[PDB]
Amino acid sequence: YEHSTVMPNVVGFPYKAHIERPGYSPLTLQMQVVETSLEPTLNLEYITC
């Protein structure tokens, strides 16, 4: 059963997705982030010492 939602990218924000499947009891699916590494690609232009 597909279900698409959007959460706020805020660490420690107790987001609570709520899926309403007709013919079934609605299910609350709580989820939260704990750390979001943002690693960029690099190119070593040169080294200075």
Residues that bind its own copies (CB under 8 A): 1, 14, 16, 18, 21-23, 25-28
In this structure, are residues 21 and 1 in contact, taking their beta carbons and an 8 Å threshold? Answer: yes
What is the nearest approach in angstroms of its own copies to the Cβ of residue 10?
12
Enter the DSSP assignment of 37: -
CB of residue 35 to its own copies, shortest distance in Å: 21
Q: Which is nearer to its own copies, 24 or 46 (CB)?
A: 24
Residue 10 contacts by C-beta under 8 Å, 6 or more apart in sequence?
33
Q: What are 31's strand-pairing partners?
A: 15
In the complex, least distance from residue 34 CB atom to its own copies, rounded to whole angstroms: 18
